[PDB]
């Protein structure tokens, strides 16, 4: 019904991840998987957006559009290309990104880990191997020159619940996803990423640089059909809630939401045949983030919430505007209800490599895969303008009360 001004210092921006935009990330586990014999990965990442060279243009564009914040990742595979050999070259590359954000009036949120790992880290047995926790923490300590000045927010591990899910697949040797919901996570990896996270928090806080640290959650918005509450709770806990519980002592927690999955007495039910879908196959559900935020609050307590990824894969930008109008309304609504939300970062700043395909275009900013030309979409112009306005618009539908 009425507009909700940004809280003071509210993050307003977009998010990317190194492997999805940078191009030539050739020391990652993913680079190997993309080219392995028998890979199921539909297409290779290759040059992606070449943000390795073109992040200056990325950030010029974001700032010009009126965004005030940029979440990007720094890449362990580059920083530690072989075990024990830290690249000062790549550390400086990443420090230049932080400084470059600041010089363009963008507050940088730094993700230290976004799914990919060094191939050597995978080859030695991944998150569940002996020493994996110490290895991650050492990498985190080594990022100190990148994050010790000018960075207010660090994300340790992006969506550890997706890590645990995929480890569950790899352990069973499963290649396909169920028609709804998520594969049983590997509880071993669950434990390992949680211990890795706490150790990373210690490392960042040890810098005594005031950094707010936490991690981000792939919120599924599991909804119980009436009667199926207990099944829904059991299903969601290892997939989501256990990672939110591990964040209860953190300085902030990231909410990443896109769609919803209904759960019946037998478990996850797929979207109806006739309901609107996005280019990811997911049900179009603009109000997801609303439920994601509220569920996250219920579980995590009073840890500040930030939306660190939210959007839609679509070829129709006016449908993206629709999606954000509903998502922003849910953010406003949660704020007005008194949730402590301190930022909104859209997924994604650019069209990017969506873990195996380039067809699932999530970008505010269009990318030509041949020339690397950036073209802001209209959604980008509108959302960006809110960085100056600093007020969340509402949809024209009525609230209760
Ligand atoms: O791969 C099957 C199953 O493994 C699960 O992990 C188990 C682990 O918790 C247990 O300690 C040991 C005991 O030998 O067995 C398994 O490794 C994992 O959580 C599931 O995702 C997998 O489906
Ligand atoms: O897919 C768009 C972006 O979203 C993230 O990962 C999502 C996750 O949020 C969601 O729960 C699952 C559904 O099974 O899909 C993943 O792709 C990542 O932050 C981004 O890398 C990803 O591109
Ligand atoms: Cl090196
Ligand atoms: Cl990384």
Numbering used by the authors: 10 to 410
The paper states:
A structure of the enzyme in complex with sophorose (β‐1,2‐glucodisaccharide) was obtained as a Michaelis complex. To obtain a complex structure with a substrate, residues Glu168 and Glu318, which are candidates for an acid/base and a nucleophile involved in the catalytic reaction, were replaced with glutamine and glycine residues, respectively. Because soaking with usual concentrations of Sop2 (approximately 10–20 mM) did not yield sufficient electron density of Sop2, crystals of the E318G mutant prepared without Sop2 were soaked in a cryoprotected solution containing 500 mM Sop2. The overall structure of the complex is almost the same as that of the ligand‐free enzyme, although the space groups of the crystals were different between the ligand‐free and the complex structures. In chain B, the electron density of Sop2 was clearly observed and the Glc moiety at subsite −1 adopted a chair conformation (4 C 1). In chain D, the Glc moiety at subsite −1 adopts a skewed conformation (1 S 3), which is often observed in the Michaelis complex in GH enzymes (Nakajima et al. 2016; Tanaka et al. 2019). The Glc moiety at subsite −1 is firmly recognized by multiple residues (Gln29, His123, Asn167, Tyr267, Gln363, Trp364) through hydrogen bonds. In contrast, only a single hydrogen bond is observed at subsite +1, involving Gln229. The six‐membered ring of the Glc moiety at subsite +1 is sandwiched between Met171 and Trp291 hydrophobically. These observations suggest that substrate recognition at subsite +1 is loose, being consistent with the disordered electron density at subsite +1 in Chain D. However, the anomeric hydroxy group at subsite +1 faces solvent, suggesting that Sop2 binds correctly to the enzyme in the crystal.
β‐Glucosidases, major enzymes that release glucose from various natural compounds, are phylogenetically classified into glycoside hydrolase (GH) families. In this study, functional and structural analyses of a GH1 enzyme from Streptomyces griseus (SGR_2426 protein) were performed. SGR_2426 showed the highest hydrolytic activity toward p‐nitrophenyl β‐glucopyranoside among p‐nitrophenyl sugars. This enzyme showed hydrolytic activity toward β‐1,2‐glucooligosaccharides specifically among β‐linked glucooligosaccharides. SGR_2426 is the first identified β‐1,2‐glucan‐associated β‐glucosidase in the GH1 family.
